[PDB]
Structure 1
């Protein structure tokens, strides 16, 4: 939509550009049904869009992690994402900036699966953490689920309209698409590094095009 596109462009221009371009993937799960979450112990049903299914989320996290570990050969050298990414905490923490709904779950399979309850009921899980985080992306403490943070170790709040698409109004839980975005240095003032970055981007494009997961359709822009 035009409104969301305007919001994203303003966010990327402020927080990444002019030194960084953005790589962006749109991920859908067209063969996955939407579902209904029923809060414990009672509460109105909360609809969740197709790609917010827990198995789809694990599969998208695997896609994200795979992307971070892509390398490219250039002049017999190995070029990594960490060479060309935005890494605010370097040299301490050399992790790259990469935005997705998995950011709300520390980009972790185990955290995504966090839950509490008894032998019969689950009291809280990723559903309630999601609903909380899309209303308070800057929170470092979800009291209803084990004090798990929404906000990541660096980068500032991840607004849901950066990482979700296809919902109605501002009902983010009805998202029909996931968005993965990460900045890559344009190296406007260094031809050698620019050529290496382009070698990485070319391998990324090829990676995406050859990615095999029957549950996901991945597209660019």
Structure 2
């Protein structure tokens, strides 16, 4: 998957996870006021997205030690908003909701019907991932917290044509510095990667199967 990209150009490599929801069924979203039904695959169930967001947040918080120093993802990641540590690049469907549990829960509706919710936002954002403003009543941005668009074909798997709603897998990608010319900083990044591998290997959630992708 990320082999073909040159990982992320010559100076960054990617840690990448593929995530499926084996104990979750698909479900129907009915657009308001009228319109054809849109089925959403298992990993786009609202609760599995919340659970995948917790996984993602936990990954961001992983630390490793090398000598007496501490190594965070923020020390090694691609963060294009500013020259100094910042909001790390995470290619994920959760970045359409700015990696926020509350934004994912945003909804507009009356006492009984839903006008707009995460389905509505999703279906807009896969068509306009750089948008700062959903055209629906939510008016939420699509842009990821790292300051760039997340293209839908990079963060979803197992869908037909461009029906991203029918995805059977989520793909999560963190670019990190390869540090080809800096030996001391590469060792720190590799220390972090070892903790990342451990974290993923020991992560317990019956609702998710988490795998590393084949390079």
Q: Which category describes the TM-score, using the shorter chain as reference length? A: over 0.9
TM-score (norm 2): 0.93
Q: Distance in 2 between matches of 1:103 and 1:74?
A: 30
Q: CA contact under 8 A between 2:95 and 2:145: conserved in structure 1?
A: no
CA RMSD of aligned residues (A): 1.8
Residues 177-202 of structure 1, C-alpha deviations (whole Å, 9 max, x = no match): 00000111111111111111100000
State the secondary structure of the residue aligned to 1:183: strand
* Equivalenced residues, count: 213
What do the CA deviations read for 1:13-71 (whole angstroms, capped 9, x no partner)? 47932110011000000110011111122221111010000000000111111000100
For the structure 1 residues 197 and 92, does the alpha-carbon distance in structure 2 shift closer, same or farther, using more than 3 Å as the test?
A: closer
**Higher alpha-carbon deviation: 20-29 or 114-123:** 114-123
Q: Is the 8 A contact 2:23 2:207 kept in 1?
A: yes
Instruction: Tell whether the 8 Å contact from 1:12 to 1:22 is kept in structure 2 after alignment.
Output: no
Q: 1:162 is paired with a residue of what secondary structure? A: helix
Distance 1:79 1:37 in 2: 43
For structure 2, the residue ranges without an aligned partner over 5 or more in a row are: none
SS of the residue corresponding to residue 95 of structure 2 reads helix
Structure 1 length-normalised TM: 0.91
SS of match in other structure, 2:16: strand
2:181 is aligned with 1:158: no
Contact 2:117/2:138 (<8 A) preserved: no
CA distance in 2, matches of 1:152, 1:108: 11
Residues 130-141 of structure 1 aligned to structure 2 (within 5 Å): 130-141=122-133
Displacement, 1:76? 2.1
Q: Give the deviation of 1:206 after TM superposition.
A: 0.5
Q: 1:78 to 1:12 in 2, by over 3 A?
A: farther
Alpha-carbon separation, structure 1, partners of 2:144 and 2:43: 21
Contact 2:74 2:85 in 1 (8 A): no
Q: Which moved more, 1:134-143 or 1:21-30?
A: 134-143
Using a 3 Å threshold, how does the CA distance of structure 1 residues 202 and 164 change in structure 2: closer, same or farther?
Answer: same
- Residue 171 of structure 2 aligns to a residue whose secondary structure is strand
| Structure 1 gaps, min length 5 | 1-8
Cα displacement (A) at 1:92: 6.5
Q: Higher helix proportion, which one?
A: 1
Shift of 1:75: 1.0
For the Cα contact (< 8 Å) 2:87–2:146, is it kept in 1?
no
Whether the 8 Å CA contact 2:21–2:42 is kept in 1: the answer is yes
> Using the alignment, how far apart are the partners of 1:90 and 1:75 within structure 2?
28
